[PDB]
């Protein structure tokens, strides 16, 4: 397994998910694939907390299960649950889920300065602050609606995602090949 | 259970775990090692790592700070709020490619 791709998904799990997620991972990124059960035993979680963890990152794929299914010694049937980070599709849901959130801002930035600001009383247009300046009457005083002339009434967060988004789409370049 | 002298000794334990994949270690553990072992784990700061049980136990981990990363919680949120988990992966190919992705 290629370094930058260990790396990315080191990152992507400190950054989004929480302290268990991470130590959890650390044990998929130390071996391939492996048991819950060990999984436990090393983490010392509680069951129900490991399995909640385990059950989001499958969630969001970024970890798979196969189960192992056997007699063991006593005779009975034994169900084992393997685990391992499927780098394919973990790529896939960072890359779809950092396309969305931009998108996100992107729209909620547009929706800001689109905003109604200002609003006619009488026949209902509204403007946004750029187009409110241009409604300003010098000889009355005030905004005054560019339809009816009736005096109008009232009523960055991508900088700071592409600042501390840049790691990630730098170690999503790295991994490209 | 465990041997743990002093502060340098508890880091050494960590360190020597997350380097040999020997897991979590019981604060209650370190405590009844390690006497007035507050100190000691104040003194390391966020050298480790703490995990809370439900029965409130904690659970003590090396921070390895080779992969450090974070970001505002307002992007945490949002991430959170990219629902994958009810899609199927073909269809979230379809997505990656619409986008020119
Ligand atoms: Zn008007």
């Known amino acids: 397994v290629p370094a930058a ?26 071996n391939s694939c492996v ?14 907390q490991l399995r ?31 685990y391992f980070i499927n780098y394919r599709t973990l790529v896939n849901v960072v890359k779809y889920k950092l396309d969305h959130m931009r998108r996100r801002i992107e729209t909620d930035e547009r929706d800001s300065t689109n905003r109604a600001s200002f609003k006619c ?12 300046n241009q409604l300003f009457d010098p000889m009355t005083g005030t ?27 730098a170690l999503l370049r790295e991994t490209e090949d | 259970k465990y041997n743990v002298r002093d502060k340098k000794a508890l880091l050494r334990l960590l360190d020597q775990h997350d380097q040999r994949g020997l897991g979590g270690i019981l604060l209650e553990d370190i405590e009844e090692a390690l006497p ?7 003194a390391l700061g966020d050298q ?22 974070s970001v505002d919680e307002e ?14 992966e073909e269809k979230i190919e379809e997505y990656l490619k619409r986008q020119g992705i």
Not at chain 1, 5 to 30: M, N, P, S, T
Not at chain 2, 36 to 42: I, L, M, R, T
Request: aromatic letters at 12%; charged letters at 30%.
């Open chain 1, 5 to 30: 791709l260990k790396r990315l998904a080191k990152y992507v799990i400190r950054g989004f998910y929480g302290i268990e997620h991470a130590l959890a991972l650390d044990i998929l990124i130390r």
């Open chain 1, 35 to 48: 048991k819950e059960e060990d999984m436990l035993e090393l983490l010392k979680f509680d069951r129900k």
């Open chain 1, 52 to 82: 909640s963890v385990l059950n989001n990152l499958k969630g969001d794929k970024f970890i798979k299960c196969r189960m192992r299914v056997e007699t063991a010694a006593d005779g009975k049937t034994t169900r084992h649950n393997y």
């Open chain 1, 121 to 132: 009383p009488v026949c209902s247009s509204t403007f946004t602050d750029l187009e409110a």
């Open chain 1, 143 to 169: 905004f005054r609606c560019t339809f009816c002339h009736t005096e109008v009434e009232e009523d960055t967060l991508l900088a700071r995602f592409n600042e501390q988004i840049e790691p990630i789409y």
């Open chain 2, 36 to 42: 007035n072992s507050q100190k000691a784990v104040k």
């Open chain 2, 48 to 69: 480790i790592l703490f995990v809370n049980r439900p029965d409130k136990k904690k659970i003590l981990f090396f921070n390895d700070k080779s992969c450090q990363f």
């Open chain 2, 75 to 88: 992007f945490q949120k949002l991430w959170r709020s990219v629902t994958v988990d009810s899609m199927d």
